[PDB]
Amino acid sequence: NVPFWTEEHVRATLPERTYGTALLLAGSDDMPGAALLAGLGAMRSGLGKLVIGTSENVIPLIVPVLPEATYWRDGWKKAADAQLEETYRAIAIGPGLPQTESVQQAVDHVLTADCPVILDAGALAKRTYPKREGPVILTPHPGEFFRMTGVPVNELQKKRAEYAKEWAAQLQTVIVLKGNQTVIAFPDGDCWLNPTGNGALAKGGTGDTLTGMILGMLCCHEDPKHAVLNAVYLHGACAELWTDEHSAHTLLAHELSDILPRVWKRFE
């Protein structure tokens, strides 16, 4: 069946430490937290610089915790009106964003850039993608996969790998289908199962940190496929480290980012 992306694979593909500038389009007035979670995840993951295109009111909520980030005021809204005039190593859009047509407009404009693009949360919708050199990485939860494909959650959960591989090929996008054993399906037919992680991840916010982690690693890995696989793996590994001395019921998403420094070290 589908092979696991093992510690062996992680150790052989992680980069040895410019590291690129990433753009994170995330966070809105009622879902501001996602921008901080994704921002922390991204900056913890090897990038050189991070520009956060978030709503004006969200900026002040990020600064005290992540003073290393800089901003593109109302970036995700502005992205809906015109193509980006700045060059980025990788872009992520969706965490904390509403499921609206305006967000989809921003997605269309972002896709014209020459770099890997991650779509998550609010940026995930039933649609098709334009031919481009950079990979498009979708990170849906089962419910969002249903929104994207029409495949019922109850049906999807019975054949996760098959459906993920099926749609990654049909859409020609990378698909990180989250769950107990996250499936990573690539457009070229490659597919893997993530072996790390536990129920501590089944709580709001962990997906936002993952999106940030993928964004950051896309900036330090020469191979985007390895960046995605290693991000999903390390994200789960942080949750496993947490449960050694803490109850899986008590993890807060932002703590995965606090743990990554030591976990990553182990794989070097």
Curated annotation (Swiss-Prot):
Nucleotide-binding recorded as keyword: yes
An annotated GO BP: nicotinamide nucleotide metabolic process
Cofactor(s) listed in the protein's UniProt record: Mg(2+)
Binding, AMP: K178, G179, N180, Q181, T182, G207
Domain YjeF C-terminal: residue ranges: 6-267
EC number: 4.2.1.136
Keyword set, alphabetical order: ATP-binding, Lyase, NAD, NADP, Nucleotide-binding
Taxonomy, superkingdom: Bacteria
Binding sites annotated in the UniProt record for (6S)-NADPHX: A34, G96, H141, D208
GO molecular function, one term: NAD(P)HX epimerase activity
UniProt catalytic activity: (6S)-NADHX + ADP = AMP + phosphate + NADH + H(+); (6S)-NADPHX + ADP = AMP + phosphate + NADPH + H(+)
InterPro entries (alphabetical): Carbohydrate_kinase_pred_CS (IPR017953), CARKD (IPR000631), Ribokinase-like (IPR029056)
Family: Belongs to the NnrD/CARKD family.
Role of this protein: Catalyzes the dehydration of the S-form of NAD(P)HX at the expense of ADP, which is converted to AMP. Together with NAD(P)HX epimerase, which catalyzes the epimerization of the S- and R-forms, the enzyme allows the repair of both epimers of NAD(P)HX, a damaged form of NAD(P)H that is a result of enzymatic or heat-dependent hydration.
PANTHER family, alphabetized: ATP-DEPENDENT (S)-NAD(P)H-HYDRATE DEHYDRATASE, ATP-DEPENDENT (S)-NAD(P)H-HYDRATE DEHYDRATASE FAMILY MEMBER
Entries under NCBIfam families matching the protein: yjeF_cterm
Quaternary structure, from the entry: Homotetramer.
UniProt-recorded name of the protein: ADP-dependent (S)-NAD(P)H-hydrate dehydratase
Species the sequence originates in: Bacillus subtilis (strain 168)
Gene name as annotated: nnrD
